[PDB]
């Protein structure tokens, strides 16, 4: 029952040239679950298309779910929420029985009309950011999931969530047993552990302790192992714990280029990829190509954290490659986790321009899960 949960950032269709990634760029046999990111809500709970020209007029919802014509076993979910959607309107919706009912009915209508198999709830986050009702959100989130499950069971539909990873974040938002109870699985967002918002360089998804980190109070550090062990410990059964992995890296401007280890002083966000066009973020497709075309980069492996990083003068980049992806999936196998979730399919090296075949990261996930390697 190992699963591979592929998020698709559907705005990638607007990229140009080799960065453009449409629905028909998806390989429906490299995922078991494919997730359409994102739909949204209003404060009264009405589910809505965030890019109706694409989603509705140009038929993108239906093209996405029509991937089941190629792989009939594929499950196609629609994800509501995401970073840009924020928290306020979800806080408002979840607190009012009438708005929860409206959300259940309107999300169900979109799911059935466009032939989705279920709903992924990505509220970022209960009791955080621009939340309106604060700690009430923790209870109201679990009530929302319970009521979604009750209705969705009439139609055989899936209900999943994406959640913050490390304990310090999770305890702000979730009662873990009540979240796990109603969902088919929990996708733990075990990435964005560190980024250009930090005062020092750090890894986006370190597995264990990183270079430059203190080992005292190790359980408080932001890494994948601490997050997974927290969720398991808090009552998420392994068969409902899907471990997130990133198909992107994060970029930094060093304060002093001669000090370029992990946990070195940083001055802010670094380079942007040509297509993702956001300083501080770079897709794997973009950065593997940058490394291939410029031999001046230095690539190192942090052998504490089991992840690579690269630097060139002021640029310092945390990323994940085939080797570190292998270590991550071996880790998940070793704890009998339900599977792997990835953000996001459109920044794998989907064209195979970096010499390791098309979709090297996604194929790595599928291969290591199929083989069952634990070390």
* Helix-, strand-, coil-residue percentages of the chain, each rounded to 5: 35, 20, 40
* Structure-token pair, residue 167: 């304990």
Residue 334 main-chain phi, psi, to 5 deg: -65, -25
What are phi and psi for residue 103, nearest 5 degrees? -65, -45
- Cα(130)–Cα(86) distance, integer angstroms: 7
Query: DSSP letter string over 159-199?
Result: EEEEE--SHHHHHHH--HHHHHHHSSEEEE----SS-TTSS
Q: Cα(225)–Cα(190) distance, rounded to whole angstroms? A: 9
Burial (0-12, 13-18, 19+ Cβ within 10 Å), 307: buried
Q: Which of 85, 124, 213, 330 is catalytic?
A: 124
Rg (CA), the chain: 20
1 within 8 A of 338, measured Cβ to Cβ: yes
Backbone dihedral angles phi then psi of residue 305, each to the nearest 5 degrees: -85, -15
Question: Using CA atoms, how far apart are residues 324 and 301, in angstroms rounded to an integer?
Answer: 9
The residues facing 160 across adjacent strands are 120, 185
Distances (CA, A) of 237 to 185, 229, 242, 298: 9, 11, 10, 41
Query: What tokens were used for 48?
Result: 């809505």
Query: Could you give the CA distance from residue 28 to residue 30 in angstroms, rounded to a whole number?
Result: 6
Tokens 């297509």 map to which residue?
A: 275
Residue 251 to residue 195: CA distance in whole angstroms? 7
Element (H, E) at 281: strand 281-283
**Please, where are the H alpha helices in the chain?**
52, 60-65, 88-95, 97-113, 136-152, 167-173, 176-182, 224-233, 284-293, 322-334, 360-371
User: Cα separation of 236 and 3, whole Å?
Assistant: 16
Phi, psi of 295 (to 5 degrees): -75, -10
CATH class entry, domain 3-246+320-371: alpha beta
124 is annotated as an active-site residue:
yes
Q: How was this structure determined?
A: X-ray
Q: What is the resolution of this structure in A?
A: 1.6
- Between CA 231 and CA 244 the distance in angstroms is 13
Q: Quote the crossing angle between the two packed helices 360-371 and 322-334, to the nearest 10°.
A: 30
What residues form DSSP beta bridges with 318? 250, 309
Strand partners for 292: none
């Amino acid at each position: 029952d190992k699963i591979v949960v592929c998020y698709y950032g559907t705005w990638a269709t607007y990229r140009t040239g080799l960065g453009k990634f449409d629905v028909d760029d998806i390989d429906p046999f490299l995922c078991t679950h494919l997730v359409y990111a994102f739909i949204g809500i209003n404060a009264e709970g009405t589910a809505l298309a965030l890019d109706p020209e694409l989603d509705v007029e140009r038929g993108n919802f239906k093209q996405f779910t029509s991937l089941k014509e190629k792989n009939p076993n594929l499950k196609t979910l629609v994800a509501v929420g995401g970073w840009s959607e924020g928290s306020a309107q979800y806080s408002i919706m979840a607190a009012e029985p009438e708005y929860r009912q409206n959300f259940i009915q309107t999300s169900l209508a979109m799911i059935l009309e466009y032939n989705f198999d279920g709903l992924d709830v990505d509220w970022e986050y209960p009791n955080r950011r621009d939340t309106v009702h604060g700690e009430d959100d923790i209870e109201q989130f679990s009530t929302l999931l319970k009521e979604l499950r009750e209705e969705f069971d009439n139609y055989g539909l899936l209900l999943t969530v994406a959640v913050s990873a490390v304990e310090e974040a999770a305890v702000q938002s979730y009662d873990v047993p009540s979240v796990a109870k109603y969902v088919d699985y929990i996708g733990v967002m075990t990435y964005d552990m560190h980024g250009a918002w930090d005062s020092v360089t750090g890894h986006n998804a370190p597995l264990f302790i990183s270079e430059g980190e203190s080992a005292e109070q190790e359980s408080t550090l932001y890494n994948v192992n601490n997050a997974v062990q927290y969720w398991l410990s808090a009552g998420c059964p392994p068969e409902k714990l899907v471990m997130g992995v990133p198909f992107y890296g994060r970029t930094f401007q060093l304060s002093d280029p001669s000090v370029n280890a992990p946990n070195s002083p940083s001055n802010g966000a670094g380079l942007a990829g040509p297509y993702t066009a956001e300083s501080g973020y770079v897709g794997y497709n973009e950065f593997c190509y940058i490394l291939q075309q410029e031999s001046s980069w230095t690539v190192q492996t942090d052998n504490l954290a089991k992840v690579p990083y690269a630097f060139l003068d002021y640029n310092w980049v945390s990323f994940d490659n085939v080797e570190s992806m292998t270590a991550k999936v071996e880790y998940a196998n070793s704890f009998n986790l339900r599977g792997i979730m990835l953000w996001s399919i459109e920044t794998d090296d989907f064209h195979g321009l970096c010499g390791e075949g098309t979709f090297p990261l996604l194929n790595t996930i599928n291969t290591v899960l199929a083989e069952g390697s634990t070390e």
